[PDB]
Amino acid sequence: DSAINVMKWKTVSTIFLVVVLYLIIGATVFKALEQPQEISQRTTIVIQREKFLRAHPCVSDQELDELIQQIVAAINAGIIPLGASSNQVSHWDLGSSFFFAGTVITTIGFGNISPRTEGGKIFCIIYALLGIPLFGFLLAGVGDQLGTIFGKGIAKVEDTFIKWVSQTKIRIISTIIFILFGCVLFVALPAVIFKHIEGWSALDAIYFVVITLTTIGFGDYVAGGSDIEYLDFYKPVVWFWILVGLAYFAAVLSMIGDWLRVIAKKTKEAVGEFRAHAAE
Amino acid sequence: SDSAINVMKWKTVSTIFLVVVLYLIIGATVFKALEQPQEISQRTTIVIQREKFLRAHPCVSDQELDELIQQIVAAINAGSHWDLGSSFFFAGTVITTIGFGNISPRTEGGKIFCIIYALLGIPLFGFLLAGVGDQLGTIFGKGIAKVEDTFIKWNVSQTKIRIISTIIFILFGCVLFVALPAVIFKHIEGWSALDAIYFVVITLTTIGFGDYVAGGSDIEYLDFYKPVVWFWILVGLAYFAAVLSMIGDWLRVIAKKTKEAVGEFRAHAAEWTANV
Ligand SMILES: CS(=O)(=O)Nc1ccc(C(=O)NCc2ccc(Cl)cc2Cl)cc1
Ligand SMILES: CS(=O)(=O)Nc1ccc(C(=O)NCc2ccc(Cl)cc2Cl)cc1
Ligand SMILES: CCCCCCCCCCCCCCCC
Ligand SMILES: CCCCCCCCCCCCCCCC
Ligand SMILES: CCCCCCCCCCCCCCCC
Ligand SMILES: CCCCCCCCCCCC
Ligand SMILES: CCCCCCCCCCCC
Ligand SMILES: CCCCCCCCCCCC
Ligand SMILES: CCCCCCCCCCCC
Ligand SMILES: CCCCCCCCCCC
Ligand SMILES: CCCCCCCCCCC
Ligand SMILES: CCCCCCCCCCC
Ligand SMILES: CCCCCCCCCC
Ligand SMILES: CCCCCCCC
Ligand SMILES: CCCCCCCC
Ligand SMILES: CCCCC
Ligand SMILES: CCCCC
Ligand SMILES: CCCCC
Ligand SMILES: [K+]
Ligand SMILES: [K+]
Ligand SMILES: [K+]
Ligand SMILES: [K+]
Ligand SMILES: [K+]
């Protein structure tokens, strides 16, 4: 029993170090990419500050930094503190609390909207702990249904491509068609609709798709997030997209996992060779 | 018959789908019931503070306030955020799919790298998290070998003691991975006791709203704090993975028990109505 456990802990620990190292590379590449724009916006926000620090000296000026604290603290709930727009829609209306519930059970958790009430928080804890598992079943069923829809599709395509054919190499043609068609239906096509309806850039759309469907859900972009107009054919279609798109990414991510298993065997055995053939 | 099983399958999906739709509807109404009020009371008392800042400082005209707020909304779309350690944290938020979003890429390259980083990193982390799950799982397996010996040579024996074991998992698990860290968070972050547990749950379920983030404020943090929080995430995620999974099983059970209870209720209105 302990013989396999010693072999297991050895594997976990190496993957752990790989993960630590993956984070370090990651970290350096993100700071390489973002630290600059952050500094150029931090210098040009101090420029804008001084233009109204000294352009109104009759303001206490310790209370300006405190004013902004009260705006940024209050923006998190979601305020539109203007006199040319003192009338305002609700964040917790019939539909947005529905959306919010969606963000909890799917663990996307955008967080543009999140509970402020101690009761809302306590309900959210309970709602999540029951809802996440519940949704998991739905998402599984959605995965199966969609899986068998594609099974009927590959029965028709693995017959017509039976020319003068291997068992294990037509598997490679199938997984390409899964990724190809899948990226159209669940990534490309919806990003295009998002690009048009939200006014996002082409990158922002795909970025949103991926961040949402991987359940990362930063919440920097949220489809349905602004007050624009919205056809109301729109948002329901986006629910359905989430439902099926999450199922799709579940598989895709899972495939990527398998590819890593493979690449990890191939590299484990390559290093053994490379060590043994020190001559080279 | 191949379509015969598929009609039975789609029947199952569709009922769970309706249960989910209905779970969302109840949810929706309970959240709006809870939050629509605080929203109104903060919308009245933010308009009060708005007008209260024109009168208590007449130096500021009404036209320059609207422009100030434009520059503050511009600056929420930035905020160092991206130092050595916070970009490390950020990477953590991507691969774990917690995704707080207090920090997120603004550069078109940062976004493209994030897409790639995620698609490779999420699966990679999943392996780590699995290993962490196993190790922790067998640590508790040795723990229950010692506790299912000392209690199993005396009072009421097998088939109900499985229920006592799962309570010990939940009891001790909630101490180690929820209570104890919430207490540390309460003290170190200055959050309320509820806010701490709220954070724990929102983070460890990988929902990660990002309303609260441990390490998120500009406080003197002991060098030992943040790394301990990494370790907590690693093990706490593994813990919730199991817990959530258990809850799933309980639902499976409760769903059979309710499916057959409806079958009973039906079957007695049957042979009670045949009685004419
Ligand atoms: C900023 S707001 O909260 O005040 N306004 C709203 C914002 C979004 C939505 C909505 O339904 N979007 C589609 C959707 C559905 C379910 C899930 Cl899980 C994710 C997504 Cl993107 C509705 C209102
Ligand atoms: C605006 S900021 O970027 O400067 N604030 C920060 C916030 C948090 C951390 C950090 O390391 N927290 C521990 C931690 C680790 C990994 C994961 Cl996944 C989640 C968590 Cl909560 C660093 C900076
Ligand atoms: C207009 C560009 C759209 C590109 C869509 C991104 C693809 C995300 C899915 C991951 C699998 C991609 C296969 C590439 C093999 C290296
Ligand atoms: C109009 C500008 C559109 C820019 C589209 C570029 C997106 C490229 C996505 C890269 C996906 C790489 C997949 C790697 C899988 C491991
Ligand atoms: C964003 C790209 C990051 C790429 C990840 C780094 C590659 C690390 C390779 C680790 C090699 C360890 C070999 C051990 C074999 C037993
Ligand atoms: C047969 C599988 C259903 C696929 C239907 C396409 C859904 C795309 C929704 C895009 C909306 C933004
Ligand atoms: C384009 C980036 C490719 C990164 C390849 C990841 C390989 C991980 C190997 C894990 C070894 C155990
Ligand atoms: C630090 C040592 C670097 C070793 C480089 C090996 C890269 C593995 C690629 C595997 C493709 C088959
Ligand atoms: C939110 C909980 C409501 C309970 C719904 C019961 C569903 C009845 C279907 C039973 C299967 C025959
Ligand atoms: C404008 C509010 C949008 C809510 C749509 C609810 C319908 C859910 C059905 C899922 C296909
Ligand atoms: C447009 C930004 C792309 C960054 C490329 C980083 C690739 C790193 C590979 C390290 C082996
Ligand atoms: C500080 C009070 C927090 C209470 C949390 C209640 C959780 C009950 C779990 C039900 C699944
Ligand atoms: C808190 C009670 C949740 C009830 C779920 C029951 C599932 C019913 C499936 C028929
Ligand atoms: C046999 C399954 C019924 C499918 C209904 C339409 C969705 C593909
Ligand atoms: C073995 C229990 C570890 C708990 C760590 C708590 C740190 C916040
Ligand atoms: C304090 C209100 C509790 C709602 C569950
Ligand atoms: C998280 C429970 C889902 C079961 C497939
Ligand atoms: C219909 C517009 C296509 C954008 C690539
Ligand atoms: K978030
Ligand atoms: K999130
Ligand atoms: K998640
Ligand atoms: K998950
Ligand atoms: K998330």
mmCIF file of C-alpha atoms in Angstrom, chain B residues 39-145:
data_model
loop_
_atom_site.group_PDB
_atom_site.id
_atom_site.type_symbol
_atom_site.label_atom_id
_atom_site.label_comp_id
_atom_site.label_asym_id
_atom_site.label_seq_id
_atom_site.Cartn_x
_atom_site.Cartn_y
_atom_site.Cartn_z
ATOM 1 C CA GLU B 39 -29.333 49.362 -3.121
ATOM 2 C CA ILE B 40 -32.067 52.009 -2.666
ATOM 3 C CA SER B 41 -30.757 53.162 0.746
ATOM 4 C CA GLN B 42 -27.245 53.584 -0.727
ATOM 5 C CA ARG B 43 -28.681 55.350 -3.822
ATOM 6 C CA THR B 44 -30.522 57.886 -1.682
ATOM 7 C CA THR B 45 -27.508 58.394 0.678
ATOM 8 C CA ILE B 46 -25.051 58.774 -2.274
ATOM 9 C CA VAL B 47 -27.224 61.563 -3.781
ATOM 10 C CA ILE B 48 -27.227 63.154 -0.288
ATOM 11 C CA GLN B 49 -23.384 63.073 -0.165
ATOM 12 C CA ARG B 50 -23.297 64.428 -3.757
ATOM 13 C CA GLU B 51 -25.371 67.539 -3.010
ATOM 14 C CA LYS B 52 -23.782 67.792 0.479
ATOM 15 C CA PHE B 53 -20.363 68.285 -1.267
ATOM 16 C CA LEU B 54 -21.546 71.202 -3.461
ATOM 17 C CA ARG B 55 -22.929 73.169 -0.451
ATOM 18 C CA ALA B 56 -20.214 72.366 2.149
ATOM 19 C CA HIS B 57 -17.637 73.427 -0.491
ATOM 20 C CA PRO B 58 -19.202 76.199 -2.690
ATOM 21 C CA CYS B 59 -15.719 76.661 -4.262
ATOM 22 C CA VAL B 60 -16.639 73.682 -6.510
ATOM 23 C CA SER B 61 -19.232 74.432 -9.214
ATOM 24 C CA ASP B 62 -21.753 71.748 -10.343
ATOM 25 C CA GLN B 63 -20.098 71.424 -13.792
ATOM 26 C CA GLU B 64 -16.625 70.399 -12.512
ATOM 27 C CA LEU B 65 -18.040 67.573 -10.323
ATOM 28 C CA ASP B 66 -19.403 65.620 -13.313
ATOM 29 C CA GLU B 67 -15.928 65.900 -14.932
ATOM 30 C CA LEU B 68 -14.182 64.753 -11.707
ATOM 31 C CA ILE B 69 -16.315 61.605 -11.581
ATOM 32 C CA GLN B 70 -15.528 60.899 -15.282
ATOM 33 C CA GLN B 71 -11.806 60.886 -14.341
ATOM 34 C CA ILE B 72 -12.496 58.555 -11.336
ATOM 35 C CA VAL B 73 -14.495 56.120 -13.532
ATOM 36 C CA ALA B 74 -11.586 56.305 -16.011
ATOM 37 C CA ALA B 75 -9.247 55.401 -13.095
ATOM 38 C CA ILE B 76 -11.323 52.412 -11.824
ATOM 39 C CA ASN B 77 -10.373 50.819 -15.181
ATOM 40 C CA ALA B 78 -6.746 50.849 -13.897
ATOM 41 C CA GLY B 79 -6.889 51.070 -10.052
ATOM 42 C CA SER B 80 1.630 48.884 -7.792
ATOM 43 C CA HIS B 81 -0.872 46.290 -9.070
ATOM 44 C CA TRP B 82 1.587 44.433 -11.314
ATOM 45 C CA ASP B 83 4.737 44.137 -9.190
ATOM 46 C CA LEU B 84 6.785 40.910 -8.701
ATOM 47 C CA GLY B 85 4.231 39.330 -6.331
ATOM 48 C CA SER B 86 0.834 40.569 -7.506
ATOM 49 C CA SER B 87 1.384 39.270 -11.037
ATOM 50 C CA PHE B 88 2.185 35.939 -9.313
ATOM 51 C CA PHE B 89 -1.136 36.238 -7.434
ATOM 52 C CA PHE B 90 -2.858 37.138 -10.667
ATOM 53 C CA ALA B 91 -1.463 33.992 -12.329
ATOM 54 C CA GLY B 92 -2.871 32.109 -9.346
ATOM 55 C CA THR B 93 -6.301 33.628 -10.007
ATOM 56 C CA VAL B 94 -6.178 32.446 -13.638
ATOM 57 C CA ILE B 95 -5.097 28.835 -13.246
ATOM 58 C CA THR B 96 -7.301 28.181 -10.191
ATOM 59 C CA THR B 97 -10.272 29.843 -12.020
ATOM 60 C CA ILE B 98 -11.013 31.804 -8.855
ATOM 61 C CA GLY B 99 -10.500 34.890 -10.976
ATOM 62 C CA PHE B 100 -11.119 37.635 -8.363
ATOM 63 C CA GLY B 101 -10.488 40.287 -11.019
ATOM 64 C CA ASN B 102 -9.334 43.053 -8.682
ATOM 65 C CA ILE B 103 -6.330 42.787 -11.088
ATOM 66 C CA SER B 104 -6.906 41.855 -14.754
ATOM 67 C CA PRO B 105 -5.010 42.577 -17.990
ATOM 68 C CA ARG B 106 -5.533 45.874 -19.849
ATOM 69 C CA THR B 107 -2.885 45.393 -22.596
ATOM 70 C CA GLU B 108 -4.023 43.491 -25.746
ATOM 71 C CA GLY B 109 -0.929 41.302 -25.219
ATOM 72 C CA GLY B 110 -1.744 40.668 -21.567
ATOM 73 C CA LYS B 111 -5.179 39.484 -22.702
ATOM 74 C CA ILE B 112 -3.805 37.225 -25.437
ATOM 75 C CA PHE B 113 -1.225 35.808 -23.008
ATOM 76 C CA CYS B 114 -4.016 35.300 -20.420
ATOM 77 C CA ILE B 115 -6.048 33.282 -22.914
ATOM 78 C CA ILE B 116 -3.017 31.044 -23.586
ATOM 79 C CA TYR B 117 -1.906 30.992 -19.956
ATOM 80 C CA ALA B 118 -5.373 29.865 -18.860
ATOM 81 C CA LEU B 119 -5.959 27.158 -21.478
ATOM 82 C CA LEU B 120 -2.652 25.491 -20.523
ATOM 83 C CA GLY B 121 -2.598 26.454 -16.856
ATOM 84 C CA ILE B 122 -6.084 25.380 -15.809
ATOM 85 C CA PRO B 123 -5.502 21.743 -16.850
ATOM 86 C CA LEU B 124 -1.998 21.801 -15.375
ATOM 87 C CA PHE B 125 -3.234 23.056 -12.015
ATOM 88 C CA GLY B 126 -5.995 20.430 -12.131
ATOM 89 C CA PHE B 127 -3.367 17.711 -11.956
ATOM 90 C CA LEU B 128 -1.685 19.390 -8.973
ATOM 91 C CA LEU B 129 -5.023 19.839 -7.276
ATOM 92 C CA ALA B 130 -5.847 16.178 -7.904
ATOM 93 C CA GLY B 131 -2.597 15.029 -6.334
ATOM 94 C CA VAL B 132 -3.234 17.372 -3.411
ATOM 95 C CA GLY B 133 -6.691 15.818 -3.158
ATOM 96 C CA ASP B 134 -5.334 12.278 -3.102
ATOM 97 C CA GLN B 135 -2.601 12.993 -0.549
ATOM 98 C CA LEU B 136 -5.012 14.765 1.740
ATOM 99 C CA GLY B 137 -7.544 11.966 1.103
ATOM 100 C CA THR B 138 -5.143 9.265 2.304
ATOM 101 C CA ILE B 139 -4.029 11.392 5.314
ATOM 102 C CA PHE B 140 -7.693 11.230 6.411
ATOM 103 C CA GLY B 141 -7.883 7.498 5.464
ATOM 104 C CA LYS B 142 -5.194 6.782 8.092
ATOM 105 C CA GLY B 143 -7.168 9.042 10.467
ATOM 106 C CA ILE B 144 -10.415 7.030 10.000
ATOM 107 C CA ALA B 145 -8.588 3.676 10.352
#
